[PDB]
PDB file of C-alpha atoms and ligand atoms in Angstrom:
ATOM      1  CA  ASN A   1     -21.497  -9.808  -3.923  1.00 10.09           C
ATOM      2  CA  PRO A   2     -20.130  -6.556  -5.569  1.00 12.50           C
ATOM      3  CA  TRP A   3     -16.923  -8.238  -6.630  1.00 14.16           C
ATOM      4  CA  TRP A   4     -18.641 -11.076  -8.453  1.00  9.39           C
ATOM      5  CA  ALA A   5     -21.024  -8.486  -9.944  1.00 13.46           C
ATOM      6  CA  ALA A   6     -18.076  -6.475 -11.379  1.00 14.15           C
ATOM      7  CA  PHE A   7     -16.216  -9.583 -12.594  1.00 17.12           C
ATOM      8  CA  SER A   8     -19.391 -10.997 -14.211  1.00 17.26           C
ATOM      9  CA  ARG A   9     -20.195  -7.646 -15.869  1.00 16.81           C
ATOM     10  CA  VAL A  10     -16.746  -7.484 -17.551  1.00 16.84           C
ATOM     11  CA  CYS A  11     -17.156 -11.048 -18.776  1.00 19.60           C
ATOM     12  CA  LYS A  12     -20.585 -10.168 -20.266  1.00 23.20           C
ATOM     13  CA  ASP A  13     -19.010  -7.005 -21.871  1.00 21.90           C
ATOM     14  CA  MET A  14     -16.331  -9.224 -23.447  1.00 15.96           C
ATOM     15  CA  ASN A  15     -18.777 -11.986 -24.444  1.00 18.06           C
ATOM     16  CA  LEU A  16     -16.902 -14.593 -22.311  1.00 16.61           C
ATOM     17  CA  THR A  17     -18.873 -17.660 -21.315  1.00 15.30           C
ATOM     18  CA  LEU A  18     -18.194 -18.497 -17.644  1.00 17.32           C
ATOM     19  CA  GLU A  19     -18.689 -21.817 -15.913  1.00 17.68           C
ATOM     20  CA  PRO A  20     -18.705 -21.171 -12.132  1.00 15.55           C
ATOM     21  CA  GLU A  21     -17.473 -24.176 -10.180  1.00 17.61           C
ATOM     22  CA  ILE A  22     -16.984 -24.780  -6.463  1.00 18.19           C
ATOM     23  CA  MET A  23     -13.756 -23.411  -4.943  1.00 21.07           C
ATOM     24  CA  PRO A  24     -11.271 -26.126  -4.000  1.00 21.04           C
ATOM     25  CA  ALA A  25     -10.118 -26.259  -0.398  1.00 18.60           C
ATOM     26  CA  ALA A  26      -6.511 -25.836  -1.641  1.00 18.76           C
ATOM     27  CA  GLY A  27      -4.158 -23.287  -3.063  1.00 20.47           C
ATOM     28  CA  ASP A  28      -3.464 -19.749  -1.996  1.00 20.24           C
ATOM     29  CA  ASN A  29      -7.195 -18.938  -1.889  1.00 19.30           C
ATOM     30  CA  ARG A  30      -7.736 -21.585   0.827  1.00 17.08           C
ATOM     31  CA  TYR A  31      -5.823 -19.312   3.198  1.00 17.72           C
ATOM     32  CA  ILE A  32      -7.024 -15.960   1.870  1.00 15.97           C
ATOM     33  CA  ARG A  33     -10.711 -17.028   2.050  1.00 14.31           C
ATOM     34  CA  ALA A  34     -10.198 -18.604   5.542  1.00 16.30           C
ATOM     35  CA  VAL A  35      -9.095 -15.145   6.890  1.00 19.79           C
ATOM     36  CA  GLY A  36     -12.254 -13.573   5.542  1.00 17.52           C
ATOM     37  CA  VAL A  37     -11.125 -11.982   2.257  1.00 18.39           C
ATOM     38  CA  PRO A  38     -13.602 -12.510  -0.677  1.00 17.35           C
ATOM     39  CA  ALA A  39     -11.880 -14.158  -3.647  1.00 17.52           C
ATOM     40  CA  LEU A  40     -12.305 -15.911  -7.000  1.00 16.03           C
ATOM     41  CA  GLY A  41     -10.103 -18.445  -8.758  1.00 13.71           C
ATOM     42  CA  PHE A  42      -9.646 -17.557 -12.430  1.00 16.02           C
ATOM     43  CA  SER A  43      -7.060 -18.135 -15.195  1.00 18.43           C
ATOM     44  CA  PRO A  44      -8.154 -16.889 -18.665  1.00 20.25           C
ATOM     45  CA  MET A  45      -7.408 -20.146 -20.524  1.00 19.46           C
ATOM     46  CA  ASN A  46     -10.093 -21.482 -22.856  1.00 19.74           C
ATOM     47  CA  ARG A  47      -9.653 -23.907 -25.787  1.00 15.96           C
ATOM     48  CA  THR A  48      -6.747 -25.305 -23.738  1.00 14.77           C
ATOM     49  CA  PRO A  49      -6.336 -28.953 -22.638  1.00 15.28           C
ATOM     50  CA  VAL A  50      -6.161 -29.397 -18.852  1.00 13.13           C
ATOM     51  CA  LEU A  51      -2.426 -30.037 -18.381  1.00  8.41           C
ATOM     52  CA  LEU A  52      -1.436 -28.662 -14.983  1.00  5.03           C
ATOM     53  CA  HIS A  53       1.182 -31.009 -13.443  1.00  4.69           C
ATOM     54  CA  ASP A  54       1.432 -33.041 -16.695  1.00  2.00           C
ATOM     55  CA  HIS A  55       4.073 -33.616 -19.379  1.00  2.00           C
ATOM     56  CA  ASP A  56       3.921 -31.123 -22.265  1.00  2.00           C
ATOM     57  CA  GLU A  57       2.031 -28.518 -20.249  1.00  2.00           C
ATOM     58  CA  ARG A  58       1.609 -25.741 -22.819  1.00  2.00           C
ATOM     59  CA  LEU A  59      -0.370 -22.637 -23.636  1.00  2.00           C
ATOM     60  CA  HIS A  60      -1.036 -21.088 -27.074  1.00  2.00           C
ATOM     61  CA  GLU A  61       0.391 -17.600 -27.354  1.00  2.00           C
ATOM     62  CA  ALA A  62      -2.914 -16.093 -28.650  1.00  2.00           C
ATOM     63  CA  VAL A  63      -4.809 -17.481 -25.630  1.00  2.00           C
ATOM     64  CA  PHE A  64      -2.100 -16.002 -23.410  1.00  2.00           C
ATOM     65  CA  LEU A  65      -2.368 -12.570 -25.147  1.00  2.00           C
ATOM     66  CA  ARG A  66      -6.157 -12.560 -25.024  1.00  2.00           C
ATOM     67  CA  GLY A  67      -5.737 -13.312 -21.284  1.00  2.00           C
ATOM     68  CA  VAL A  68      -3.703 -10.132 -20.788  1.00  2.00           C
ATOM     69  CA  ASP A  69      -6.526  -8.235 -22.580  1.00  2.00           C
ATOM     70  CA  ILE A  70      -9.134  -9.785 -20.240  1.00  2.00           C
ATOM     71  CA  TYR A  71      -7.200  -8.616 -17.154  1.00  2.00           C
ATOM     72  CA  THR A  72      -6.932  -5.113 -18.694  1.00  2.00           C
ATOM     73  CA  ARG A  73     -10.749  -5.030 -18.494  1.00  2.00           C
ATOM     74  CA  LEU A  74     -11.135  -6.844 -15.130  1.00  2.00           C
ATOM     75  CA  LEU A  75      -8.705  -4.628 -13.266  1.00  2.00           C
ATOM     76  CA  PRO A  76     -10.498  -1.287 -13.871  1.00  2.00           C
ATOM     77  CA  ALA A  77     -13.801  -2.859 -12.926  1.00  2.00           C
ATOM     78  CA  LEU A  78     -12.597  -4.469  -9.675  1.00  2.00           C
ATOM     79  CA  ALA A  79     -10.443  -1.474  -8.671  1.00  2.00           C
ATOM     80  CA  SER A  80     -13.391   0.926  -9.297  1.00  2.00           C
ATOM     81  CA  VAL A  81     -15.999  -0.855  -7.126  1.00  2.00           C
ATOM     82  CA  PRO A  82     -17.283   2.089  -5.018  1.00  4.09           C
ATOM     83  CA  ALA A  83     -16.811   2.309  -1.257  1.00  4.69           C
ATOM     84  CA  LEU A  84     -18.553  -0.537   0.615  1.00  8.88           C
ATOM     85  CA  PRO A  85     -19.458  -1.153   4.273  1.00 10.17           C
ATOM     86  CA  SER A  86     -16.370  -3.390   4.414  1.00  9.74           C
ATOM     87  CA  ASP A  87     -14.097  -0.384   3.617  1.00  9.27           C
ATOM     88  CA  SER A  88     -14.865   1.300   6.944  1.00  9.12           C
TER      89      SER A  88
ATOM     90  CA  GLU B   7      12.895 -12.712 -33.582  1.00  9.82           C
ATOM     91  CA  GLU B   8       9.629 -10.789 -33.936  1.00 11.31           C
ATOM     92  CA  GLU B   9       7.364 -11.590 -30.916  1.00 10.21           C
ATOM     93  CA  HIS B  10       4.837  -9.763 -28.788  1.00 11.30           C
ATOM     94  CA  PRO B  11       6.765  -8.356 -25.762  1.00 12.31           C
ATOM     95  CA  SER B  12       4.255  -9.835 -23.314  1.00 12.76           C
ATOM     96  CA  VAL B  13       5.033 -13.285 -24.747  1.00 12.49           C
ATOM     97  CA  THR B  14       8.740 -12.600 -24.527  1.00 10.07           C
ATOM     98  CA  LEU B  15       8.378 -11.712 -20.817  1.00 12.05           C
ATOM     99  CA  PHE B  16       6.268 -14.809 -20.215  1.00 14.44           C
ATOM    100  CA  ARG B  17       8.914 -17.017 -21.820  1.00 14.19           C
ATOM    101  CA  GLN B  18      11.676 -15.328 -19.765  1.00 14.45           C
ATOM    102  CA  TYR B  19       9.832 -16.063 -16.515  1.00 16.73           C
ATOM    103  CA  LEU B  20       9.067 -19.685 -17.633  1.00 18.18           C
ATOM    104  CA  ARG B  21      12.819 -20.238 -17.912  1.00 15.58           C
ATOM    105  CA  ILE B  22      13.396 -19.384 -14.222  1.00 15.71           C
ATOM    106  CA  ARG B  23      13.645 -22.827 -12.614  1.00 13.41           C
ATOM    107  CA  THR B  24      11.230 -22.421  -9.625  1.00 13.83           C
ATOM    108  CA  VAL B  25      10.699 -26.188  -9.687  1.00 13.83           C
ATOM    109  CA  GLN B  26      10.035 -28.143  -6.492  1.00 13.56           C
ATOM    110  CA  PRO B  27      11.551 -29.518  -4.307  1.00 15.83           C
ATOM    111  CA  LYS B  28      14.299 -26.763  -4.362  1.00 18.82           C
ATOM    112  CA  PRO B  29      12.906 -23.853  -6.450  1.00 18.68           C
ATOM    113  CA  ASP B  30      15.242 -21.045  -7.637  1.00 18.61           C
ATOM    114  CA  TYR B  31      13.219 -18.548  -5.578  1.00 18.18           C
ATOM    115  CA  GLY B  32      16.180 -16.115  -5.402  1.00 20.19           C
ATOM    116  CA  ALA B  33      15.997 -15.665  -9.199  1.00 18.67           C
ATOM    117  CA  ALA B  34      12.175 -15.260  -9.135  1.00 16.27           C
ATOM    118  CA  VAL B  35      12.344 -12.585  -6.367  1.00 16.99           C
ATOM    119  CA  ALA B  36      15.051 -10.771  -8.344  1.00 14.04           C
ATOM    120  CA  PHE B  37      12.878 -10.881 -11.480  1.00 15.66           C
ATOM    121  CA  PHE B  38       9.922  -9.355  -9.619  1.00 16.49           C
ATOM    122  CA  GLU B  39      12.107  -6.691  -7.968  1.00 18.48           C
ATOM    123  CA  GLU B  40      13.521  -5.656 -11.359  1.00 19.34           C
ATOM    124  CA  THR B  41      10.050  -5.705 -12.893  1.00 15.41           C
ATOM    125  CA  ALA B  42       8.775  -3.441 -10.067  1.00 15.64           C
ATOM    126  CA  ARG B  43      11.621  -0.993 -10.780  1.00 13.57           C
ATOM    127  CA  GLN B  44      10.876  -0.996 -14.573  1.00 15.01           C
ATOM    128  CA  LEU B  45       7.123  -0.542 -14.028  1.00 15.65           C
ATOM    129  CA  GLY B  46       7.499   2.070 -11.258  1.00 12.33           C
ATOM    130  CA  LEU B  47       5.720  -0.117  -8.672  1.00 12.13           C
ATOM    131  CA  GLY B  48       6.501  -0.238  -4.985  1.00 13.83           C
ATOM    132  CA  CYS B  49       8.166  -3.494  -3.909  1.00 13.26           C
ATOM    133  CA  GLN B  50       8.092  -5.120  -0.465  1.00 14.41           C
ATOM    134  CA  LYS B  51       9.809  -8.455   0.308  1.00 12.20           C
ATOM    135  CA  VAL B  52       8.393 -10.315   3.299  1.00 12.01           C
ATOM    136  CA  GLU B  53      10.465 -13.322   4.395  1.00 13.69           C
ATOM    137  CA  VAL B  54       7.810 -15.394   6.140  1.00 15.15           C
ATOM    138  CA  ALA B  55      10.176 -18.289   6.817  1.00 17.12           C
ATOM    139  CA  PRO B  56      13.964 -18.510   6.144  1.00 14.35           C
ATOM    140  CA  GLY B  57      14.320 -18.961   2.396  1.00 15.29           C
ATOM    141  CA  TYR B  58      10.657 -18.117   1.690  1.00 11.86           C
ATOM    142  CA  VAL B  59      10.161 -14.515   0.455  1.00 13.98           C
ATOM    143  CA  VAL B  60       6.748 -13.200  -0.488  1.00 14.10           C
ATOM    144  CA  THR B  61       7.065 -10.312  -2.956  1.00 15.67           C
ATOM    145  CA  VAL B  62       4.380  -7.664  -3.060  1.00 17.98           C
ATOM    146  CA  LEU B  63       4.230  -5.122  -5.966  1.00 17.15           C
ATOM    147  CA  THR B  64       1.953  -2.196  -5.318  1.00 17.77           C
ATOM    148  CA  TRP B  65       0.140   0.327  -7.565  1.00 20.30           C
ATOM    149  CA  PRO B  66      -1.491   2.810  -5.122  1.00 17.69           C
ATOM    150  CA  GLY B  67      -5.044   3.960  -6.020  1.00 18.39           C
ATOM    151  CA  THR B  68      -6.453   7.438  -5.892  1.00 19.21           C
ATOM    152  CA  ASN B  69      -8.411   6.625  -2.707  1.00 20.40           C
ATOM    153  CA  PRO B  70      -5.780   4.679  -0.718  1.00 22.60           C
ATOM    154  CA  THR B  71      -8.036   4.331   2.317  1.00 22.26           C
ATOM    155  CA  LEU B  72     -10.417   1.903   0.363  1.00 21.41           C
ATOM    156  CA  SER B  73      -9.594  -1.767   0.684  1.00 23.05           C
ATOM    157  CA  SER B  74      -7.321  -3.104  -2.038  1.00 21.14           C
ATOM    158  CA  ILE B  75      -7.438  -5.551  -4.885  1.00 22.88           C
ATOM    159  CA  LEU B  76      -5.041  -8.473  -4.475  1.00 17.85           C
ATOM    160  CA  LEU B  77      -3.811 -10.153  -7.649  1.00 19.60           C
ATOM    161  CA  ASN B  78      -2.173 -13.236  -6.124  1.00 21.51           C
ATOM    162  CA  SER B  79      -0.165 -16.089  -7.607  1.00 25.07           C
ATOM    163  CA  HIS B  80       2.392 -18.722  -6.674  1.00 26.25           C
ATOM    164  CA  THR B  81       5.932 -18.816  -8.149  1.00 28.43           C
ATOM    165  CA  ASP B  82       6.729 -22.524  -7.634  1.00 28.62           C
ATOM    166  CA  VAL B  83       5.887 -25.301 -10.095  1.00 33.30           C
ATOM    167  CA  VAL B  84       5.625 -29.071  -9.632  1.00 30.63           C
ATOM    168  CA  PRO B  85       8.441 -31.430 -10.752  1.00 29.57           C
ATOM    169  CA  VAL B  86       8.874 -33.020 -14.186  1.00 30.30           C
ATOM    170  CA  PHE B  87       9.796 -36.362 -15.726  1.00 31.98           C
ATOM    171  CA  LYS B  88      11.678 -34.589 -18.474  1.00 33.08           C
ATOM    172  CA  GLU B  89      12.094 -37.790 -20.645  1.00 32.68           C
ATOM    173  CA  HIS B  90       8.339 -37.621 -21.307  1.00 30.22           C
ATOM    174  CA  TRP B  91       8.390 -34.121 -22.744  1.00 27.78           C
ATOM    175  CA  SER B  92       8.441 -32.980 -26.381  1.00 28.17           C
ATOM    176  CA  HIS B  93      10.471 -29.906 -25.479  1.00 27.51           C
ATOM    177  CA  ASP B  94      12.611 -29.083 -22.381  1.00 25.32           C
ATOM    178  CA  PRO B  95      10.117 -28.034 -19.693  1.00 24.04           C
ATOM    179  CA  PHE B  96      12.309 -25.040 -18.671  1.00 24.16           C
ATOM    180  CA  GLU B  97      13.267 -23.866 -22.196  1.00 25.61           C
ATOM    181  CA  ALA B  98       9.887 -22.258 -22.928  1.00 28.48           C
ATOM    182  CA  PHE B  99      10.169 -23.354 -26.578  1.00 32.64           C
ATOM    183  CA  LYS B 100       7.428 -21.848 -28.755  1.00 32.76           C
ATOM    184  CA  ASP B 101       6.548 -23.985 -31.778  1.00 29.02           C
ATOM    185  CA  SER B 102       5.664 -22.751 -35.241  1.00 29.57           C
ATOM    186  CA  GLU B 103       1.931 -23.192 -34.474  1.00 25.49           C
ATOM    187  CA  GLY B 104       2.250 -20.805 -31.500  1.00 25.22           C
ATOM    188  CA  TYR B 105       2.295 -23.242 -28.565  1.00 26.68           C
ATOM    189  CA  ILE B 106       4.609 -22.394 -25.645  1.00 27.73           C
ATOM    190  CA  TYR B 107       5.758 -25.565 -23.811  1.00 27.05           C
ATOM    191  CA  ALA B 108       6.895 -25.229 -20.182  1.00 23.77           C
ATOM    192  CA  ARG B 109       6.292 -26.472 -16.679  1.00 24.62           C
ATOM    193  CA  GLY B 110       4.275 -23.488 -15.378  1.00 25.31           C
ATOM    194  CA  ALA B 111       2.833 -22.424 -18.742  1.00 27.70           C
ATOM    195  CA  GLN B 112      -0.676 -23.222 -17.364  1.00 29.52           C
ATOM    196  CA  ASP B 113      -0.036 -23.497 -13.623  1.00 28.64           C
ATOM    197  CA  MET B 114       0.397 -20.658 -13.031  1.00 26.47           C
ATOM    198  CA  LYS B 115       3.150 -18.388 -14.418  1.00 26.23           C
ATOM    199  CA  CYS B 116       0.864 -17.245 -17.248  1.00 25.51           C
ATOM    200  CA  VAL B 117      -1.377 -15.512 -14.729  1.00 27.42           C
ATOM    201  CA  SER B 118       1.509 -13.756 -12.940  1.00 26.46           C
ATOM    202  CA  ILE B 119       2.742 -12.284 -16.201  1.00 25.76           C
ATOM    203  CA  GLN B 120      -0.803 -11.416 -17.255  1.00 27.31           C
ATOM    204  CA  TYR B 121      -1.299  -9.418 -14.096  1.00 26.43           C
ATOM    205  CA  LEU B 122       2.041  -7.596 -14.632  1.00 24.58           C
ATOM    206  CA  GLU B 123       1.381  -6.788 -18.304  1.00 26.25           C
ATOM    207  CA  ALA B 124      -2.202  -5.685 -17.621  1.00 24.73           C
ATOM    208  CA  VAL B 125      -0.957  -3.346 -14.898  1.00 26.51           C
ATOM    209  CA  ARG B 126       1.870  -2.097 -17.126  1.00 25.90           C
ATOM    210  CA  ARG B 127      -0.533  -1.304 -19.998  1.00 25.16           C
ATOM    211  CA  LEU B 128      -3.206   0.369 -17.875  1.00 23.85           C
ATOM    212  CA  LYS B 129      -0.618   2.426 -15.888  1.00 20.74           C
ATOM    213  CA  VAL B 130       1.595   3.540 -18.785  1.00 19.12           C
ATOM    214  CA  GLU B 131      -1.572   4.439 -20.798  1.00 19.33           C
ATOM    215  CA  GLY B 132      -2.618   6.844 -18.043  1.00 20.59           C
ATOM    216  CA  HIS B 133      -5.441   5.000 -16.237  1.00 20.36           C
ATOM    217  CA  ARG B 134      -6.059   5.511 -12.511  1.00 19.77           C
ATOM    218  CA  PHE B 135      -8.533   3.695 -10.195  1.00 18.05           C
ATOM    219  CA  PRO B 136      -9.731   4.452  -6.676  1.00 15.42           C
ATOM    220  CA  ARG B 137      -8.465   1.124  -5.184  1.00 13.91           C
ATOM    221  CA  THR B 138      -4.858   0.187  -4.703  1.00 14.92           C
ATOM    222  CA  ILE B 139      -3.790  -2.987  -6.509  1.00 15.63           C
ATOM    223  CA  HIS B 140      -1.212  -5.304  -4.891  1.00 12.41           C
ATOM    224  CA  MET B 141       0.296  -8.173  -6.824  1.00 13.27           C
ATOM    225  CA  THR B 142       1.503 -10.846  -4.337  1.00 11.03           C
ATOM    226  CA  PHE B 143       3.903 -13.548  -5.531  1.00 11.45           C
ATOM    227  CA  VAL B 144       4.167 -16.350  -2.967  1.00  8.57           C
ATOM    228  CA  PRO B 145       6.447 -19.437  -2.814  1.00  7.44           C
ATOM    229  CA  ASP B 146       5.432 -22.902  -1.681  1.00  7.52           C
ATOM    230  CA  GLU B 147       1.882 -23.356  -3.010  1.00  8.55           C
ATOM    231  CA  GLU B 148       2.468 -26.737  -4.613  1.00  7.44           C
ATOM    232  CA  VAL B 149       3.345 -28.324  -1.237  1.00  6.94           C
ATOM    233  CA  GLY B 150       0.470 -26.795   0.672  1.00  7.22           C
ATOM    234  CA  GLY B 151       1.630 -23.226   1.323  1.00  5.70           C
ATOM    235  CA  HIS B 152       2.721 -23.828   4.904  1.00  4.49           C
ATOM    236  CA  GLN B 153       5.866 -21.727   4.384  1.00  3.18           C
ATOM    237  CA  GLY B 154       4.123 -19.317   1.980  1.00  6.79           C
ATOM    238  CA  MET B 155       0.581 -17.943   1.843  1.00  9.53           C
ATOM    239  CA  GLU B 156      -0.578 -19.734   5.008  1.00 11.50           C
ATOM    240  CA  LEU B 157       2.070 -17.800   6.962  1.00 11.58           C
ATOM    241  CA  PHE B 158       1.714 -14.593   4.993  1.00 13.04           C
ATOM    242  CA  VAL B 159      -1.920 -14.052   6.022  1.00 13.74           C
ATOM    243  CA  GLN B 160      -0.908 -13.711   9.711  1.00 15.51           C
ATOM    244  CA  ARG B 161       1.807 -11.129   8.968  1.00 15.88           C
ATOM    245  CA  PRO B 162       1.462  -7.414   9.861  1.00 14.12           C
ATOM    246  CA  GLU B 163       2.637  -6.696   6.305  1.00 13.19           C
ATOM    247  CA  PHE B 164      -0.388  -8.628   5.011  1.00 11.69           C
ATOM    248  CA  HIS B 165      -2.843  -6.889   7.362  1.00 14.63           C
ATOM    249  CA  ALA B 166      -1.383  -3.568   6.187  1.00 14.10           C
ATOM    250  CA  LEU B 167      -2.514  -4.325   2.576  1.00 15.55           C
ATOM    251  CA  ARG B 168      -6.113  -3.970   3.804  1.00 15.80           C
ATOM    252  CA  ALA B 169      -7.302  -6.520   1.267  1.00 10.99           C
ATOM    253  CA  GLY B 170     -10.819  -6.172  -0.036  1.00 11.81           C
ATOM    254  CA  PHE B 171     -10.885  -8.833  -2.754  1.00 11.86           C
ATOM    255  CA  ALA B 172      -8.443 -11.356  -4.247  1.00 10.34           C
ATOM    256  CA  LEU B 173      -7.873 -13.160  -7.517  1.00  9.76           C
ATOM    257  CA  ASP B 174      -5.729 -16.244  -7.843  1.00  8.66           C
ATOM    258  CA  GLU B 175      -5.491 -19.218 -10.200  1.00  7.07           C
ATOM    259  CA  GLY B 176      -8.295 -21.083 -11.977  1.00  4.76           C
ATOM    260  CA  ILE B 177      -7.722 -23.967 -14.387  1.00  5.43           C
ATOM    261  CA  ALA B 178      -7.636 -24.470 -18.132  1.00  3.01           C
ATOM    262  CA  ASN B 179     -10.901 -25.221 -19.931  1.00  2.00           C
ATOM    263  CA  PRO B 180     -10.783 -27.189 -23.237  1.00  2.91           C
ATOM    264  CA  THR B 181     -14.018 -25.616 -24.503  1.00  2.45           C
ATOM    265  CA  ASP B 182     -14.795 -22.070 -25.502  1.00  2.00           C
ATOM    266  CA  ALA B 183     -15.874 -21.397 -21.870  1.00  2.97           C
ATOM    267  CA  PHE B 184     -13.740 -20.313 -18.944  1.00  3.77           C
ATOM    268  CA  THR B 185     -13.881 -21.938 -15.505  1.00  4.45           C
ATOM    269  CA  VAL B 186     -14.159 -19.662 -12.479  1.00  5.01           C
ATOM    270  CA  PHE B 187     -13.904 -20.876  -8.831  1.00  5.66           C
ATOM    271  CA  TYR B 188     -16.678 -19.155  -6.934  1.00  4.76           C
ATOM    272  CA  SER B 189     -17.001 -18.802  -3.164  1.00  8.19           C
ATOM    273  CA  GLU B 190     -19.061 -16.475  -1.021  1.00  5.28           C
ATOM    274  CA  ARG B 191     -19.839 -15.824   2.619  1.00  4.92           C
ATOM    275  CA  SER B 192     -17.475 -18.164   4.729  1.00  5.58           C
ATOM    276  CA  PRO B 193     -15.823 -20.764   2.433  1.00  5.25           C
ATOM    277  CA  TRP B 194     -17.426 -24.197   2.477  1.00  2.00           C
ATOM    278  CA  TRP B 195     -14.348 -25.927   4.060  1.00  3.46           C
ATOM    279  CA  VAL B 196     -14.769 -23.884   7.292  1.00  3.61           C
ATOM    280  CA  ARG B 197     -18.519 -24.682   7.530  1.00  3.10           C
ATOM    281  CA  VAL B 198     -16.631 -27.054   8.695  1.00  8.08           C
TER     282      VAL B 198
HETATM  283 ZN1   ZN C   1      -1.174 -23.592  -9.146  1.00  6.14          ZN
HETATM  284 ZN1   ZN C   2      -0.334 -26.844  -9.255  1.00  4.07          ZN
END
């Protein structure tokens, strides 16, 4: 999986500990994966209580800003994966 | 007030009331259109069902025939019982300890703004990559996507993106680790 390889390499470069979990059969990725597109589910929120759909859903601004930094490293890696069989 | 401009943009978008069951999608589409114009990104609106516009922002790569990177997210958020909140869920109040309170602050408007600010920084700082990046902002995820992403993936405008790989939401983790939803080959829910 070249995409997982590039994602995982950036996370090792940044010293981020990942916990891979199964992909729920829900959300936008349900449909994208079902039409054959490889995908991951990821939001760069650590040290954050799990509050989706709850009262007082909140995010600390420094976690948010570190998340923008993480995407500034993920994007070059993913967008620079060299040509694959699937590109033809 | 002094504030990081990425945080200011996040709080602006948190204040757009894309709350189910009748999200202000018109205001969200307008926000993405104006952002595309400010960032110098191409913008395509694809109305998959009446009242349901998918917005695609595009940063073409240097090898536009390679398949693209999709940075996907949903613009709607679930309802609130506002009497149970410490701060108005659509005010995006930031407290003196740095916490931003809003419906959508975790799920998932943070990620949409993170994609936009990461693209803005990399592009304005002069980076270029072989693969095109498309940011797709879809309505309707919180009710199952049947008038959003589920329709978008059959559209000719979707096929034209030539998607090679997508990101979309994960979930908060209370520890120092980050959760990542992993899938490979054919997803497990079609196995069947
Ligand atoms: Zn979500
Ligand atoms: Zn949700």
